[PDB]
Design a protein around this ligand. Structure first.
Ligand code: 8OP
Lengths: 207, 207
């Protein structure tokens, strides 16, 4: 199946087409039917392998546009690094032209990102330490998150973000959809699946 | 996604709708994009009903009608039990109305099944012992198999059919597509995968 073969809004298919994005990777191909219907998934694939559309398209498809000033984000993507936050945000912004996407990461000041959150966001793509700095401040409100994504969860674990990731997920409604990407499914990932996911389907494309 | 949302032939969708089946189960939904594109998959789902369309629809879609007298099957579905051979043959028959499906199983004589095979077959659904016996007789020819399915591999193991299943797989062309369904993924299944499958994606829906 090409992306054209999935039940995607015409505007999303045209945004894909324009970027030369035609063909889901195998993890995407298997994940999309479930993810598009709101189901929780664990995607296990070789690190850095392409899987972004497995969560970006479900976010694009699930979230209608909003103009409401100071609205809280309806999608949260946690990723380990600024570099991945910037790359994912860019990919998501391109496939969800209707959504306000804000990247959040430390190693710079608070003002700029604080002002974006306070203005409005539909999707936040965040490194966990900086994201948590915001929740306890009262600036990041996670009470409307509909879709949470854990990107490169093994790296988040190796970096020592376990407690931050958990606290951030705990600040979201358990009624959300959760998508977990882990190369190796270590004990922490399995704890996440048990504590923070609902009957998640495992898709493993490490051949 | 409903079955109508996949790229299936209209006559196959009509066959499904005529059986009252509109919606894939999660295993079916996640499997179909890859299976319809000819890729190998391991589907980990509970024993019993709920998985047939993950292999029956790819078989229906992949195989064009043929009228050749005495033709050899292009799909082989192995089941652990005689009851399931009959059940799966019936299910496949219904969704592939353009194909001749022949059930092969013990617990009865050899004549009717042998006559059916000699007349010709597009798909054979078999228990492993009877299938290997007909292979040895030169009645069942597996040289044209394009799709091989192992439905309920765990029971095949517990019943002691490992040798027979491996011999049958070995008798088919390695160019084929292979779909393996297992509730537990025991070692034997993993070694079958390693030997007989091509970079399979694993999809585990067990709750
Ligand atoms: N279906 C798809 N087609 C093309 N590029 C994709 C894709 N899904 C996906 O995530 N990408 C990109 O592929 C990148 C990874 O590619 P890699 O490093 O494995 O060559 C990801 O970071 C994305 O930028």
């Amino acid at each position: 199946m090409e992306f054209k073969d999935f039940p995607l809004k015409p505007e999303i298919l045209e945004a894909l087409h324009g970027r030369g994005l035609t063909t889901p990777t195998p993890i995407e191909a298997a994940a999309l039917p479930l993810a598009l219907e709101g189901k929780d998934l664990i995607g296990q694939a070789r690190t850095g392998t392409g899987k972004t559309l497995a969560f970006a398209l479900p976010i694009a498809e699930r979230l209608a546009p909003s103009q409401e000033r100071g609205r809280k984000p309806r999608a949260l993507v946690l990723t380990p690094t600024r570099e991945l936050a910037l790359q994912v945000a860019s990919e998501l912004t391109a496939v969800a032209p209707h959504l306000k996407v804000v990247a959040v990461y430390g190693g710079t000041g608070y003002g700029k990102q604080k002002e974006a959150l306070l203005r409005g966001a539909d999707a936040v793509v965040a490194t966990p330490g900086r994201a948590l700095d915001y929740l306890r401040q009262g600036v990041l409100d996670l009470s409307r998150v509909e879709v949470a994504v854990l990107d490169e969860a093994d790296e988040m674990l190796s970096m020592g973000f376990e407690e931050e990731v958990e606290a951030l997920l705990s600040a979201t409604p358990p009624s959300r959809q959760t998508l977990l990407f882990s190369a190796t499914l270590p004990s922490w990932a399995k704890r996440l699946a048990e504590r923070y996911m609902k009957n998640p389907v495992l898709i493993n494309v490490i051949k």
